[PDB]
């Protein structure tokens, strides 16, 4: 389509509205109520442009550009006098009640309303009457509420209710007294409530965790990074000030997370700022602890390692690819062990084998929203892979989108689309041990043990393809539900099968692979998604290595007298008694970590590693995309005593000091080249980001905004002499504002969005090819593997049905978005949000034990008799007890395990 | 409460200043102290500044020399063009990177005793010129006795720094002769002017409004 | 049509003359807010175009400016030729009262331009600075060495990839080896400037007149080749006062750069602020009210009197009579009484704003202005009779370092030297700005010879004329706003900021991220205290300047020095330095 | 829109009432006698229209209360210069197409017609000079001319 704007010809998409077409062309139209992810509603009336039918038309008519299609032959004027006056009048009307709050408002300098007030040129107040006011609500620990600043743009309710399917936010009242919030005080229950702070164009909804230590956006040092709290790999922009991680903003990745994070990623960063973190290497001598610098630590550790007969390494899925590889080079390939348990490793390598050998395409997170039917097997996605649950909700809304497209309704007219669809949606079938948060939109929910969920999957695969192995002993009611699922999946043009390692059973993954294979054999465009546990679970699985049990028995037999543990607490993947005994038997334990873990009470050496905010590296997400995260700040800029290095830097220098008696701190690209030379399956991590020599016209990429303040005062209490800005030899970013952050710069890694006149998160418009699309020079990250030409065979290992047996309780995993991830549960803001510890019981089993709701029961697992209050679970199948995985004392390796001597005590 | 400086231009130290400083106690008997006081009185009441300027701060310093301020009243107007006859170097202006070896050479060509006043924000720290061609403070290589904030400090601020230097000179200990005795230079560790004036500064409540003359 | 509107200046007759001579496809006309026709010409035709402009019927006689620009990060180059770098040539026709800006586009690998030194001899230092700061080579330049940076400097600091701040690099560490190295690099090498060590009969003495000399007006060295006391030749060595002010222009917001404009010519104050705020107001599309114009004119004339008082008294001191500097600095204190009362500061008021001034005039300013206007004329008459009419001063200054109109034009000399040659060119009359056309004042001109004495007495007459302008400012002071009603007036009026939310929003964003200037190029030329001072601003659409080019007159006068003093005694050079009216902040920026 | 006595000889059709700058509407006409102040009548109308806003769109929800407060000031004799021009601009910018639905164009029809036909009653309420700011001691205001 060809449009004319102010006498200039432009080529646009005719299926787009005029506002998104003109913003994609770089033109400036002020707007409030429209969002790229939410569609157009025409509420705020800010986006007015004058429209003409012909070129020889001079009268024109003001229209909403967000509500007007960008068809062929339209003439519009943005800079028309009447349009400019009306847009200024809309800003002035919004200003009549707006509080005088900018100095004490957390949105200031990041506020879309400030930007549009300036953009329209409204700076003179002539309204002289009173401003309306509102009381605020308590919305929980994450979101602060200030309704005085509301402009009634309806973005919050549209996002929260229509997009995120939340139920506890709404709009109340009437004419000029419209109120946006909850029906009463309480915590916002959506797992994606944190996106309101960027969705709201004012300071009504603000980040309370950032508000505790608030700084303005210009004072922030940003870097492009990857969220470390699960395996999805959402792109984040962490920002720091005065040596502490202040905020996590969404970094737009049009392929992965686009505009949205989940609340675990947004608010679970507080472990970075814990005061008990190791900042220096510490060596234990008897009961004394001596702080070493980097060289003495390397020399002493290398001497003890040279004296040792066998050194083994225990990696972790928390650590990056480079750190795990550096440990593997330090100890040797045959002496390297992944830090996860044997069953966890078996499930992870099976998921990897399905992904890169099953012949079925694995979609990126944005691509999930385009699928026509979803079957989730075993994986409680909202608690383990939350952004996948948000994307699945969008895929479910696809049916209303299709019905509206059949009636020639434009895809941005979201209200008409929702009116046409009503309650119709694409089929979603979820299986879990209990109810899920997806059950409100699920066509069916199967609450069953993991063996029974696997058997349901095997039956679905057999009914789709008779060559798949059959399962006998299916009830006619379950058979009818199976035929419902089969008729839904067979009629889908794009079916999606989601599973993962979190269900704790190999057979659930095998059944999901069988269903995907059966759908592929019918010639369907089937996708498969596997949800891993940690940020670099897939990278550790690709790298491989022995299980934690093998490392523990090597230490226990005495064959290994030195162990180097990298970023692993070892209690999440094995019994703490066995781990403590094995680590006490070893004469040398070295722990390279950034968090104060329990295994440093027996560590002879503790290397203060960097967290993700102080390190660079590569992580592999659940769909096999290698993504580079960059260091945010130098921790030694303020505290010169801080010796906190990247884990791969520590281990590379340790290997160098062990071999040639000399210290080599190396560079990141050298380690990356070593990875891609030694491990060919990880060869794609070279292209995840350009190397440290990359420039934009000779200049590096800036980590902080050009108006970054306080350079000659922020360290002045320590010393009046300003030091050099810390140097970044590892990456293409500079630790200063003396660099490039132009929206037209040819790069993919954008540390933060800012454009002149656009200080808010709406500045991401200028960094995209089209608004709501891709970053204009490609999204960062690269897939490690393609879809294989040939698939796998059917897994014939159909399990028998679950049988309750007396005195033996099967542990059903219950994951929590706040609590089940180790580092984010260490954050202090998550303690209020985390549930109280509990044990779930069936009503029949609780009646058999003579136990009511709330009473404490004691059970023993591996010599640990722990007590827990009882919560009654209606949906949990009898013969099981529900346990919160990943909490204090409940390791996720307990998923699928058994229990003895469960009695009331 | 004294810092002792010993210079060593030919020692095993390359970084300027070519000196070592150590915190010591006052070395000061009934006649040597009186004659040291007499020498300090004579030196503090006859301070000949070096006619040396880098930028606008020099204009304010020589403004203090003129009739409306008359720094001659303190006995500090003599304004030598030669570094050999000058006692006080006022770094009055930006320490440009190209000018830094020149400033070092001129400081080297001055003779004992010598004092340094860093006048203005540029000389103090680089000031507003955090820029490629400017040394961020003359105290990166020249030992400085008095710092004057301001851009420029007004002529009476330069006079106030002259009085501050006079109080610092009046209680310093220097060798009475180069043939016999301790040759190191002892400078008293004065109380900061910020902490001295904090009591009367915080007690300020009201100032004149900026609306009248 | 407002004066700040974008114009291509196609109706300028020089465009038609260039079209008839070279053809319509030989050049591209760029529409700017500079007020000047901007013409992109090919590199191969630069000398032909310059020669054609030099030999026009009413010719372009002065190369006003010559510098470079790094266009690699400029995102808004619509209608512009493809360029990684560019070199611009600002040429003035005095008899036409017109000017033109030629622009040459350059690729990154081929960074060489033909030298302009044959057409305009003052292009030598401009090309040395463009080579120093951008790395652009000028082919055929007789000595293309660094002029702002030391000889052992790496890189070209005005390039976009060169870091601005000192804290990007290691802190300055003066060691013995470094001190010896840069002191060797500062040592004059007479073989590199084509000078011999002497004749057969006698040796030439190579003398450092500066950087620490009583007659050098700052950090400034002239290397004198002396035969006895005769100056065989001299090499003025500048760059000792280089502050990176243009680079800082790319480093500060449009508002936060104003104090830097103050310190370009540090005896000028608000005079230095005026061309910058006028050029930014052209970028912002702001027409300031009449009271703003009168306030800015009054502050400019007060600082012109301040600067002229210092200049006249220091000339008298350099000639040998040391008494009038005491009285003249008392007069400067009377001016400073008024200036401190109005702006809160003596030397660098930083008081002009985009769209106006920082505050209204305080109550009782007219009392202080009346006191100064009563105080000044008897003092000035006393200075004239006691020193300027002394025949020993006349014998030290009359006929000393003399040049004519041709020498003034070929070296870019402006201000009192140019008008001492008889050319009646003052910016406040030829191209009126800031409401100067509403004041009646004369422009003093010389008889045809630019003497030391003639330059000083012309500045005395300029002081008297500024007193007349100040009398008119005192008597006819308009009532009205001290800030314009524009949305880009930075900052807004403070009382409305403190009680109105939309004004508070505007203030919040203007002082933090900065005012957004839409992408354009602007230019403002003013009559500063020491000559013609100009700002050339390129906005790329951001809150920071993409390029801030400051043309200062002292650079041109110091380049003129060796032509006008060659073959004179050293005392003549002392008097010449005293009569130029320069400061080295102006020279080195 | 309000109509005067001269429009009483108009047929009650959509087209004929439309050409007279009004609307036939529900065709249930209301008479205004000489004892009714037009400012008070339009204030009552606008109070109804502002409080019956659904709150969806900015011009109606936030511009009708501004007109209500202006008319309240005019009724009390506390109007200030620029109030009538603000009412006229509000009538212009709340017309058809500016708002999401037709509630606000109908709201501003009587206001614009009463200003058109009975402007002398609206100017009678403007008695005080325009003042939006209080004095802040120490800061000199920017006195416009
Ligand atoms: C000595 C009695 C009072 C007179 C003060 C000196 C007269 C004004 C100084 C002029 C001057 C300026 C501005 C100046 O910048 C300079 O370079 C540092 C000089 O050379 C030393 C000067 O002489
Ligand atoms: S929401 Fe925006 S405009 Fe309102 S007080 Fe906060 S920063 Fe200011
Ligand atoms: S709370 Fe924020 S997002 Fe919701 S309507 Fe108000 S301004 Fe819009
Ligand atoms: S879904 Fe996972 S990767 Fe994404 S923000 Fe949440 S915890 Fe982080
Ligand atoms: S501190 Fe200010 S007044 Fe002094 S030299 Fe620097 S810029 Fe000039
Ligand atoms: S004009 Fe209609 S849509 Fe807009 S707020 Fe008023 S009643 Fe609601
Ligand atoms: S953005 Fe179009 S009316 Fe709100
Ligand atoms: Ca690093």
Phi, psi dihedral angles at A310 (to 5 degrees): -150, 130
* CB-neighbour burial class of residue B212 (10 A; exposed 0-12, middle 13-18, buried 19+): exposed
Q: Please list every protein residue whose CB sits less than 6 Å from any atom of ligand 2.
A: A 98, 101-102, 105, 107-108, 111, 113-114, 149, 202-203; C 505
According to DSSP H, which parts of C219-323 are helical?
245-249, 258-262, 270-284, 290-319
Cβ of residue B62 lying under 6 Å from some atom of ligand 1: yes
Atom number, ligand 4, closest to the C-alpha of residue A268: 7
Residues on chain C touching D136 (C-beta within 8 angstroms): 494-495, 498-499
Helices (H) and strands (E) in chain C, counts: 20, 15
Task: List the one residue out of A241, A64, A238, A214 whose CA is nearest residue A144.
Answer: A214
Task: List the one residue out of A772, A812, A27 whose CA is nearest residue A412.
Answer: A772
* Residue A642: both structure tokens together: 């801080």
Resolution in A: 2.4
Maximum Cα–Cα distance for chain C, whole Å? Answer: 83
Residue A698 · residue C159 · CB < 8 Å: yes
Beta bridge partners of C32: C7
Cross-chain Cβ contact D89/A89 below 8 Å = yes
* Residue A307: both structure tokens together: 């004296």
Interface test with B, best of C243, C358, C364, C529 (most B CBs within 10 A): C243
Interface test with D, best of C291, C496, C497, C500 (most D CBs within 10 A): C496
Sign of the alpha-carbon torsion through D33, D34, D35, D37: positive
* Residue B95: both structure tokens together: 């320490």
The position carrying tokens 């600075």 is C129
Number of compact structural domains in chain C: 2
- The neighbour count for residue C150, using CB atoms within 10 Å, is 17
**Cα–Cα distance, B32 to B11 (Å, whole number):** 31
Question: Separation of A130 CA from ligand 3 center, angstroms?
Answer: 21
Residue C111 · residue C124 · CB < 8 Å: no
- Buried-state track A535-551, b at ≥16 Cβ within 10 A, e below 16: bbbbbbbbbbbbbbbbb
DSSP labels, A734-797: ESSSSSB--TTSS-S--S---BTTB-SGGGGGGGBSSTTS-BTT--S-EES-PPPSS--PPP--
**Cα–Cα distance, A481 to A690 (Å, whole number):** 51
**Cα–Cα distance, B146 to B123 (Å, whole number):** 11
Maximum Cα–Cα distance for chain D, whole Å? Answer: 65
- Domain containing residue A814: 810-904
**Cα–Cα distance, B118 to A761 (Å, whole number):** 46
Strand A605-608 versus strand A588-593 pairing type: parallel
**Cα–Cα distance, C38 to C99 (Å, whole number):** 9
**Cα–Cα distance, B48 to A346 (Å, whole number):** 86
**Cα–Cα distance, B158 to C117 (Å, whole number):** 46
Question: Separation of D50 CA from ligand 3 center, angstroms?
Answer: 21
Of C172, C174, C263, the CB nearest to B136: C172
**Residue A523, CA atoms < 13 Å, CB-side half-sphere:** 0
Question: Separation of A32 CA from ligand 7 center, angstroms?
Answer: 6
* Residue C402: both structure tokens together: 């003399």
In a domain, C294, yes or no: yes
Helix %, strand %, coil % of chain A (to 5): 30, 20, 50
Question: How many residues are there in chain A?
Answer: 905
In a domain, C451, yes or no: yes
Can you give the residue ranges of every domain in chain B? 2-203
Q: Which residues of A touch B (CB under 8 A)?
A: 711-712, 720-722
Residue A238 · residue A244 · CB < 8 Å: no
* Strand ranges inside chain B, DSSP E: 2-7, 19-24, 88-92, 115-119, 146-148, 185-188
Task: List the one residue out of A794, A800, A785, A798 whose CA is nearest residue A519.
Answer: A794
**Cα–Cα distance, A181 to A154 (Å, whole number):** 11
Atom number, ligand 6, closest to the C-alpha of residue D52: 7
**Cα–Cα distance, A728 to A634 (Å, whole number):** 9
Ligand nearest to C-alpha B79:
1
Spacing of C-alpha A740 from chain mean position:
27
**Pick from C86, C110, C139: which residue ends a domain?**
C139
**Cα–Cα distance, A70 to A152 (Å, whole number):** 26
- Helix C452-475 and helix C365-383, axial crossing angle in degrees, nearest 10: 150
* Residue C120: both structure tokens together: 């305009």
Cross-chain Cβ contact C211/B99 below 8 Å = yes
Task: List the one residue out of A271, A267, A293 whose CA is nearest residue A282.
Answer: A293
**Cα–Cα distance, C132 to D70 (Å, whole number):** 65
Maximum Cα–Cα distance for chain A, whole Å? Answer: 92
CATH class of the D38-124 domain in this structure? mainly alpha
- Output the CA–CA distances (angstroms, integers) from residue D108 to A807, D23, D64, D96, in the order listed: 78, 13, 8, 10
From the CA of C210, how many Å to the nearest CA of chain A? 30
- Helix C290-319 and helix C570-580, axial crossing angle in degrees, nearest 10: 170
The position carrying tokens 């010879």 is C449
Cross-chain Cβ contact B140/A721 below 8 Å = yes
Residue A429 · residue A480 · CB < 8 Å: no
Sign of the alpha-carbon torsion through A658, A662, A663, A668: negative
Q: What is the DSSP letter of A800?
A: P
Phi, psi dihedral angles at A75 (to 5 degrees): -115, 130
Question: Separation of A200 CA from ligand 2 center, angstroms?
Answer: 11
Cβ of residue A228 lying under 6 Å from some atom of ligand 4: no
DSSP labels, A139-204: --SSEEE-GGG-----HHHIIIIIIS--SS-EEES-TT--EEE-SSSS----TTGGGHHHHSSSSS
Q: Does C474 share its domain with C335? A: yes
Phi, psi dihedral angles at C213 (to 5 degrees): -130, 145
Task: List the one residue out of A2, A46, A57 whose CA is nearest residue A25.
Answer: A2
Spacing of C-alpha A820 from chain mean position:
14
- Output the CA–CA distances (angstroms, integers) from residue A578 to A335, A548, A575, A604, in the order listed: 20, 11, 6, 18
**Cα–Cα distance, C255 to A269 (Å, whole number):** 37
Is-cis flag, bond preceding B152, omega within 30?
A: yes
- Output the CA–CA distances (angstroms, integers) from residue A542 to A350, A500, A537, D127, in the order listed: 11, 16, 9, 82
From the CA of C184, how many Å to the nearest CA of chain B? 10
Phi, psi dihedral angles at C463 (to 5 degrees): -60, -45
Question: Separation of A761 CA from ligand 4 center, angstroms?
Answer: 19
Strand A311-314 versus strand A562-566 pairing type: parallel
Q: What is the DSSP letter of B190?
A: P
Task: List the one residue out of A333, A313, A356 whose CA is nearest residue A678.
Answer: A333
Task: List the one residue out of A199, A186, A221, A143 whose CA is nearest residue A829.
Answer: A143
In a domain, C418, yes or no: yes
Helix (H) or strand (E) holding A199: helix A196-199
* Residue A767: both structure tokens together: 């960094």
Atom number, ligand 5, closest to the C-alpha of residue B60: 3
**Cα–Cα distance, A369 to A428 (Å, whole number):** 13
Q: What is the DSSP letter of A160?
A: I
Beta bridge partners of A904: A857
**Cα–Cα distance, C105 to C85 (Å, whole number):** 6
CA closest to C478 among chain D residues: D145
Question: How many residues are there in chain B?
Answer: 213
**Cα–Cα distance, A471 to A478 (Å, whole number):** 12
Strand A48-52 versus strand A75-77 pairing type: antiparallel
Residues on chain D touching A94 (C-beta within 8 angstroms): 58, 62
Q: What is the DSSP letter of C254?
A: T
**Cα–Cα distance, C525 to C428 (Å, whole number):** 9
Helix (H) or strand (E) holding A179: strand A179-181
Beta bridge partners of A562: A311, A588
* CB-neighbour burial class of residue D13 (10 A; exposed 0-12, middle 13-18, buried 19+): exposed
Strand A527-531 versus strand A495-500 pairing type: parallel
Is-cis flag, bond preceding C491, omega within 30?
A: yes
**Cα–Cα distance, C86 to C549 (Å, whole number):** 13
* Residue A128: both structure tokens together: 């002289």
In a domain, C148, yes or no: no
Of A711, A720, A721, the CB nearest to B130: A711
Of D134, D140, D144, the CB nearest to C499: D134
Task: List the one residue out of C46, C60, C66 whose CA is nearest residue C555.
Answer: C66
**Cα–Cα distance, A85 to A79 (Å, whole number):** 10
- Output the CA–CA distances (angstroms, integers) from residue C75 to A48, A743, A744, C280, in the order listed: 27, 10, 8, 20
Cα first-last separation, chain A:
74
Residues on chain B touching C150 (C-beta within 8 angstroms): 97-98
Task: List the one residue out of B70, B33, B39 whose CA is nearest residue B162.
Answer: B70
Cα first-last separation, chain B:
46
Is-cis flag, bond preceding C211, omega within 30?
A: yes
Phi, psi dihedral angles at A478 (to 5 degrees): -65, -35
According to DSSP H, which parts of C431-517 are helical?
452-475, 494-499, 501-512
**Cα–Cα distance, D49 to D91 (Å, whole number):** 13
In this structure, CATH architecture of domain B2-203 = 3-Layer(aba) Sandwich (3.40)
The position carrying tokens 């990356």 is A672
Q: Which residues of B touch A (CB under 8 A)?
A: 125, 130, 136-137, 140
Residue A808 · residue A898 · CB < 8 Å: yes
Task: List the one residue out of A498, A513, A430 whose CA is nearest residue A231.
Answer: A498
Experimental technique: cryo-EM
**Cα–Cα distance, A400 to C395 (Å, whole number):** 99
- Output the CA–CA distances (angstroms, integers) from residue A293 to A297, A604, A634, B173, C522, in the order listed: 6, 16, 17, 41, 56
Residue A701 · residue A641 · CB < 8 Å: no
**Cα–Cα distance, C255 to C431 (Å, whole number):** 26
**Pick from C113, C139, C165: which residue ends a domain?**
C139
According to DSSP H, which parts of A797-871 are helical?
822-825, 830-833, 843-848
**Cα–Cα distance, B84 to B99 (Å, whole number):** 20
- Domain containing residue C479: 245-588
**Cα–Cα distance, A252 to A603 (Å, whole number):** 41
Residue A200 · residue A145 · CB < 8 Å: no
The position carrying tokens 């944005």 is A366
**Cα–Cα distance, C68 to C159 (Å, whole number):** 10
Which residue has the CA at smallest separation from atom 2 of ligand 5? B151
Beta bridge partners of C203: C198
Residue A527 · residue A569 · CB < 8 Å: no
Beta bridge partners of A569: none
Task: List the one residue out of D14, D22, D46, D44 whose CA is nearest residue D113.
Answer: D22
Residue C217 · residue C584 · CB < 8 Å: yes
Atom number, ligand 4, closest to the C-alpha of residue A261: 5
Cβ of residue D100 lying under 6 Å from some atom of ligand 6: yes
Residue A474 · residue A459 · CB < 8 Å: yes
Strand C38-41 versus strand C98-106 pairing type: parallel
Q: Is D17 helix (H, G, I), strand (E, B) or coil?
A: helix
């Amino acid at each position: 389509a060809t449009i004319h704007v102010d006498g200039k010809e432009y080529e646009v998409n005719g299926a787009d509205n005029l506002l998104e077409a003109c913003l994609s062309l770089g033109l400036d139209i002020p707007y409030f109520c429209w969002h790229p992810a939410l569609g157009s509603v025409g509420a705020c009336r800010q986006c007015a442009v004058k429209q003409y039918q012909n070129a020889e038309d001079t009268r024109g008519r003001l229209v909403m550009s967000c509500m007007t299609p960008a068809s062929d032959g339209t003439f519009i004027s943005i800079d028309d006098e009447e349009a400019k006056q009306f847009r200024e009048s809309v800003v002035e009307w919004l200003m009549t009640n707006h509080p005088h709050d900018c100095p004490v408002c957390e949105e200031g300098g990041n506020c879309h309303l400030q930007d549009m007030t300036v953009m329209t040129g409204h700076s003179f107040r002539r309204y002289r009457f009173t401003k309306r006011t509102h009381r605020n609500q308590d919305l929980g620990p994450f979101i602060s509420h200030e309704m005085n600043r509301c402009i009634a743009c309806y973005r919050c309710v549209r996002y929260y209710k229509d997009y995120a399917d939340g139920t506890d936010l709404g709009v109340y009242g009437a004419h000029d007294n419209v109120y946006f919030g909850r029906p009463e005080d309480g915590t916002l229950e959506s797992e994606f409530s944190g996106n309101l702070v960027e969705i709201c164009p004012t300071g009504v909804f603000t980040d309370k965790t950032h508000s505790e230590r608030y700084n303005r956006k210009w004072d922030m040092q940003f870097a492009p990074s990857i969220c470390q709290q699960c395996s999805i790999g959402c792109n984040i922009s962490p920002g720091e000030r005065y040596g502490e991680l202040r905020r996590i903003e969404n970094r737009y990745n049009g392929t992965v997370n686009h505009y949205f994070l989940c609340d675990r990623g947004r608010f679970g960063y507080g472990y970075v700022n814990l005061k008990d973190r190791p900042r220096q290497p510490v060596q234990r001598r008897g009961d004394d602890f001596i702080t070493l610098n980097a060289e003495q630590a390397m020399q002493g550790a290398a001497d003890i390692l040279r004296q040792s007969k066998k050194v083994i390494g225990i990696g972790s899925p928390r650590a990056s690819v480079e750190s795990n590889f550096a440990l593997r080079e330090l100890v040797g390939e045959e002496n390297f062990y992944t830090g996860i348990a044997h069953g966890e490793q078996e499930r992870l390598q099976l998921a990897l084998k399905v992904l890169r050998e099953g012949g079925i395409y694995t979609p990126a997170l944005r691509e999930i929203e385009s699928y026509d039917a979803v079957l989730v097997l075993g994986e409680d996605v909202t608690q383990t892979g939350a952004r996948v649950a948000l994307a699945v909700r969008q895929a479910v809304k696809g049916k209303a989108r299709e019905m509206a497209a059949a009636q020639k309704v434009a895809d941005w007219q979201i209200a008409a689309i929702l009116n046409i669809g009503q309650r119709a949606k694409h089929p979603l079938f979820v299986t879990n041990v209990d109810d899920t948060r997806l059950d409100d939109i699920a066509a069916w929910t199967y609450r069953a043990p993991v063996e029974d969920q696997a058997r349901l999957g095997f039956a679905i695969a057999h009914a789709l393809d008779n060559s798949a192995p059959a399962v006998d002993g299916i009830e006619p009611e379950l058979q009818s539900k199976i035929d419902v699922i089969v008729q839904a999946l067979a009629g889908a043009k794009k079916p999606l099968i989601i599973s993962g390692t979190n269900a704790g059973s190999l057979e659930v993954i095998q059944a999901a692979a069988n269903v995907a294979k059966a759908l592929k054999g019918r010639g369907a465009d089937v996708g498969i998604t596997m949800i891993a546990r940690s940020v670099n679970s897939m990278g550790l699985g690709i790298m491989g290595g022995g299980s934690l049990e093998e490392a523990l028995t090597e230490l226990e037999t005495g064959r290994a007298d030195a162990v180097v543990v990298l970023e692993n607490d070892l209690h999440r993947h094995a019994s703490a008694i066995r781990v403590n005994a094995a680590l006490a038997k070893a004469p040398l334990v070295m722990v390279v970590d950034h968090q104060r873990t329990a295994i440093m009470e027996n560590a002879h050496l503790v290397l203060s590693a960097a967290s993700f905010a102080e390190s660079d590296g590569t992580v592999i997400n659940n769909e096999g995309r290698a993504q580079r995260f960059f260091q945010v700040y130098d921790p030694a800029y303020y505290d010169s005593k801080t010796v906190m290095l990247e884990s791969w830097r520590w281990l590379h220098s340790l290997h160098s000091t062990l071999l040639s008696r000399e210290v080599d701190w190396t560079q990141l690209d050298h380690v990356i080249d070593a990875v891609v030379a030694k491990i060919p399956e990880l060869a794609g991590i070279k292209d995840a980001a350009p190397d440290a020599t990359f420039r934009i016209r000779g200049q590096k990429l800036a980590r902080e905004p050009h108006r970054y303040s306080g350079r000659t005062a922020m360290r002045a209490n320590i010393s009046v002499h300003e030091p050099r800005q810390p140097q970044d030899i590892d990456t293409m970013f500079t630790f200063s504002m003396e660099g490039n952050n132009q929206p037209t710069a040819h790069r993919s890694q954008v540390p933060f969005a800012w454009a002149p006149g656009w200080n808010s998160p709406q500045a991401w418009n200028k960094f995209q090819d089209e608004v709501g699309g891709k970053l204009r020079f490609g999204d960062p990250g690269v897939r490690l593997f393609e879809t294989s030409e040939n698939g796998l065979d059917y897994f014939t290992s159909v399990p028998a049905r679950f049988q309750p047996q007396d005195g033996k309780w099967r542990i059903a995993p219950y994951y929590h978005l706040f609590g089940s991830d180790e580092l984010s549960q260490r954050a202090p803001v998550f303690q209020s949000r985390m549930p109280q510890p509990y044990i779930k019981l069936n009503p029949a089993d609780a009646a058999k034990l003579g136990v009511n709701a709330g009473t404490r029961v004691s059970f023993s697992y591996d010599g640990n008799t722990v007590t827990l209050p009882v919560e009654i679970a209606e949906g949990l199948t009898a013969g099981q007890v529900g346990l919160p995985m990943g909490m204090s004392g409940i390791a996720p390796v307990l998923a699928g395990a058994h229990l003895e001597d469960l009695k009331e005590a | 409460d004294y810092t002792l400086t010993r210079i060593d231009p030919n020692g095993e130290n390359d970084r300027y200043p070519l000196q070592k400083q150590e915190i010591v106690t006052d070395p000061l008997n009934v006649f040597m102290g009186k004659l040291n006081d007499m020498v300090n009185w004579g030196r503090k009441n006859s301070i000949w500044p070096y006619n040396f300027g880098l930028s606008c701060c020099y204009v304010e310093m020589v403004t203090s020399f003129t009739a409306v301020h008359d720094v001659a009243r303190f006995g500090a107007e003599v304004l030598r063009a030669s570094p050999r006859q000058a006692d006080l170097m006022v770094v009055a202006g930006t320490c440009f990177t190209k000018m830094a070896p020149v400033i070092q050479r001129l400081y080297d060509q001055m003779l004992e005793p010598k004092w340094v006043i860093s006048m203005g924000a540029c000389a103090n720290s680089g000031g507003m010129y955090d820029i490629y061609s400017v040394v961020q403070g003359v105290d990166k290589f020249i030992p400085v006795d008095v710092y004057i904030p301001g851009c420029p400090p007004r002529p009476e601020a330069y006079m106030q720094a002259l009085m501050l230097l006079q109080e610092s000179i009046g209680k310093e200990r220097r060798p009475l002769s180069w043939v016999v005795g301790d040759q190191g230079v002892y400078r008293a560790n004065m109380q900061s002017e910020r902490e001295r004036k904090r009591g009367e500064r915080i007690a300020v409540t009201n100032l004149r409004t900026p609306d009248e003359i | 049509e407002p004066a700040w509107q974008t114009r291509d200046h196609l109706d300028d007759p020089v465009i038609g003359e260039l079209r008839n001579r070279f053809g319509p496809d030989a050049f591209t006309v760029q529409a700017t807010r500079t007020g000047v026709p901007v013409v992109w010409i090919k590199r191969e035709q630069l000398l032909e175009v310059g020669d054609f402009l030099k030999k026009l019927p009413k010719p372009y006689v002065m190369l006003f400016d010559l510098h470079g620009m790094d266009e690699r990060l400029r995102t808004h180059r619509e209608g512009l030729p493809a360029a990684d770098f560019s070199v611009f040539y600002h040429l003035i026709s005095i008899d036409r009262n017109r000017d033109i800006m030629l622009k040459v586009a350059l690729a990154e690998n081929d960074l060489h331009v033909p030298t302009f030194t044959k057409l305009f001899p003052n292009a030598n230092w401009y090309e040395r600075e463009t080579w120093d700061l951008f790395g652009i080579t000028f082919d055929g330049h007789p000595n293309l060495r660094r002029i702002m940076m030391p000889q052992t400097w790496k890189g070209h600091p005005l390039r976009k990839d060169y870091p601005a701040r000192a804290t990007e690099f290691s802190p300055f560490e003066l060691t013995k080896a470094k001190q010896d190295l840069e002191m060797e690099a500062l040592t004059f090498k007479p073989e590199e400037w084509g000078m011999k060590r002497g004749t057969e009969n006698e040796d030439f003495m190579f003398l450092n007149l500066g950087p620490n000399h009583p007659s050098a007006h700052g950090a400034f060295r002239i290397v004198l080749q002396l035969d006895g006391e005769e100056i065989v030749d001299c090499v003025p060595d500048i760059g000792y006062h280089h502050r990176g002010a243009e680079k800082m222009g790319e480093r500060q917001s449009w508002h936060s750069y104003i104090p830097y404009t103050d310190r370009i010519e540090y005896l000028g104050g608000c005079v230095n602020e005026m061309p910058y705020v006028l050029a930014v107001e052209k970028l912002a599309g702001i027409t300031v009210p009449d009271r703003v114009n009168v306030i800015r004119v009054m502050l400019s004339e007060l600082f012109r009197i301040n600067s002229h008082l210092l200049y006249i008294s220091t000339f008298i001191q350099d000639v040998g009579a040391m008494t009038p500097v005491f009285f003249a600095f008392t007069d400067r204190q009377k001016i400073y009484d008024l200036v401190e009362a109005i702006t809160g500061f003596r030397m660098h008021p930083a008081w002009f704003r985009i769209g106006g001034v920082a505050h209204d005039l305080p109550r009782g300013w007219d009392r202080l202005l009346r006191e100064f206007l009563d105080w000044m004329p008897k003092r000035l008459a006393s200075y004239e009779k006691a020193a300027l009419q002394n025949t020993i001063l006349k014998g030290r200054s009359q006929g000393v370092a003399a040049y004519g109109a041709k020498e003034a034009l070929e070296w870019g000399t402006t201000g009192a030297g140019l008008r001492a040659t008889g050319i009646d060119f003052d910016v406040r009359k030829a191209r009126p700005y800031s409401g100067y056309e509403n004041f009646d004042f004369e422009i003093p001109v010389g008889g045809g010879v630019s003497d030391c004495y003639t330059r000083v007495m012309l500045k005395v007459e300029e002081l008297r004329q500024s007193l007349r302008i100040l009398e008119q400012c005192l008597n006819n002071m308009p009532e009205g706003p001290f800030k314009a009603d524009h949305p880009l007036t930075t900052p807004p009026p403070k009382e409305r900021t403190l009680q109105h939310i939309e004004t508070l929003i505007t203030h919040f964003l203007q002082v933090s991220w900065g005012p957004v200037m839409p992408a354009n190029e602007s230019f403002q030329m003013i009559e500063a205290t020491k000559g013609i001072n100009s700002y050339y601003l390129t906005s790329d659409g951001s809150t920071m300047s993409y390029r801030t080019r400051v043309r200062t007159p002292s650079f041109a006068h110091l380049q003129q020095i060796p032509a006008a003093i060659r073959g004179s005694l050293v005392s003549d050079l002392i008097v010449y330095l005293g009569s130029i009216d320069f400061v080295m902040s102006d020279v080195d920026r | 829109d309000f109509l005067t006595e001269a429009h009483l000889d108009l047929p009650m059709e959509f087209e004929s009432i439309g050409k007279a700058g009004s609307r036939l509407g529900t065709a249930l006409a209301m008479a205004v006698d000489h004892e009714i102040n037009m400012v008070s009548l339009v204030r009552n109308l606008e109070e109804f229209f502002a409080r019956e806003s659904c709150g969806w769109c900015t011009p109606c929800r936030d511009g009708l209360p501004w007109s209500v407060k202006i008319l309240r000031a005019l009724e009390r004799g506390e109007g200030q210069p620029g109030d009538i021009e603000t009412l006229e601009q509000l009538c212009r910018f709340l017309g058809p197409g500016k708002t999401f639905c037709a509630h606000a164009p109908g709201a501003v029809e009587p206001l614009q017609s009463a200003i058109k036909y009975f402007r002398e009653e609206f100017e009678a309420g403007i008695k005080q000079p325009f003042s939006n700011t209080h004095l802040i001691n120490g800061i000199q205001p920017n006195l416009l001319k």
